């Protein structure tokens, strides 16, 4: 509701975007690891 | 030549399942129109 | 806006190629599974 | 005497066939397991190449590195996990 | 004994595959849910 | 003509098993769509 307040909110929104990008990237890394595990287990089960 | 533990069936099933996964991913990209949908295929790109 | 498109969107040129390739592979894999399930019918000739 | 020698040899060879089949099972397991580590290394190299550009800030290079960390953790997991019945194949204690 | 150990290992891996698929489902849910938060934060910054 | 040690049976079984091995291999290749699946058939190729 004020000018400098508006610019501060701009900066806070930029920060929040960065934070959510970091968290989503963590999720993505875990997901890729799980996918590789699942492929390897699917093969090893057939061999066993 | 021993039956009740068909191995070719399991092998073909695993391969076809992997291929179905790839087909589903390609179709989802074709639908949404974006190369990064789930953000799990490219983190820094996203 | 163009530099972002270069990162985010997909090019239907390559995407339709990938899709058609995966579809033909799906047909081939389904045929292979159908044959694998049947590859054991020959044992009955021993028993009969 | 000759018939008993030949019967002993036939039985020993019949068991050797099963020994060979078990060795084939073990080796196939090891190889088809190692394939996934090959693919993971490919992915690691691709990600390093992706981070080697200078349109990416440290905050995105950090996401690259965090991904490589989990992938390498998975590689170690495969190596320390693939085993027949306790005999760890892809670890280094399968020598001689 | 060897056959029973191998059967136990095969069943355990077959269950671990389902565990991995459940983890995949959870992570995909979380990520596709974070997407909307990203868009909302974008809108907040634009309004500021 | 002496029975209890049928030899033609053993020989035919050996041949048929050796053939079923190649049938299985060919079917696995047909499924996966790759000429080198297990990397046990072409080292330098792989």
Alpha carbon distance E26, E20 (integer Å): 10
CB D85 within 8 A of CB A48: no
- Position of tokens 């530099």? C3
User: B11 in contact with A at a CB cutoff of 8 Å?
Assistant: yes
Query: Which residues in chain A are closer than 8 Å to D40, comparing Cβ atoms?
Result: 36
DSSP annotation of C11 reads -
Local structure of A9: helix, strand or coil:
helix
Distances (CA, A) of B44 to A22, B26, D69, D87: 9, 20, 15, 40
What are the phi and psi torsion angles at E28 (to 5°)?
-65, -40
Q: Count Cβ atoms below 10 Å from residue D15 Cβ, excluding itself.
A: 10
Q: Count Cβ atoms below 10 Å from residue A43 Cβ, excluding itself.
A: 19
User: D28 in contact with B at a CB cutoff of 8 Å?
Assistant: no
Alpha carbon distance D65, D74 (integer Å): 14
Nearest CA to B46 out of C4, A31, D71, A15 is that of C4
CB D90 within 8 A of CB D34: yes
In A, what residues contact D, Cβ < 8 A? 18, 21-22, 25-26, 28-30, 32-33, 36-37, 39-40, 43-44, 47-48
Q: Is the dihedral of CA D20, D26, D32, D37 positive or negative?
A: negative
Q: How was this structure determined?
A: cryo-EM
């Amino acid at each position: 509701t004020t000018l400098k307040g508006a610019m501060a909110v701009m900066d806070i929104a930029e920060t929040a975007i960065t934070n959510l990008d970091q968290i989503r990237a963590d999720i993505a890394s875990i997901q890729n690891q799980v996918t590789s595990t699942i492929n390897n287990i699917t093969v090893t089960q057939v061999n066993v | 030549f021993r039956i009740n533990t068909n191995v070719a069936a399991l092998n073909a099933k695993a391969n076809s399942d992997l291929n179905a996964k790839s087909l589903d991913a390609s179709l989802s990209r074709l639908s949404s129109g974006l190369r990064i949908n789930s953000a799990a295929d490219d983190a820094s790109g996203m | 806006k163009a530099a972002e498109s270069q990162i985010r969107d997909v090019d239907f040129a390559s995407e339709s190629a990938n899709y058609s390739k995966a579809n033909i592979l799906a047909q081939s894999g389904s045929y292979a599974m159908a044959q694998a399930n049947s590859s054991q019918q020959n044992v009955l000739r021993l028993l009969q | 005497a000759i018939a008993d020698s030949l019967r002993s040899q036939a039985n020993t060879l019949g068991q050797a066939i099963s020994n060979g089949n078990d060795a084939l099972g073990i080796l196939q397991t090891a190889d088809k397991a190692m394939d996934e580590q090959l693919k993971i290394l490919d992915t690691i190299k691709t990600k390093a190449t992706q981070a080697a550009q200078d349109g990416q800030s440290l905050k995105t290079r950090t996401m690259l590195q965090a991904d490589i960390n989990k992938l390498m953790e998975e590689l170690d997991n495969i190596a320390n996990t693939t085993s027949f019945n306790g005999k760890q194949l892809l670890s280094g204690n399968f020598t001689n």
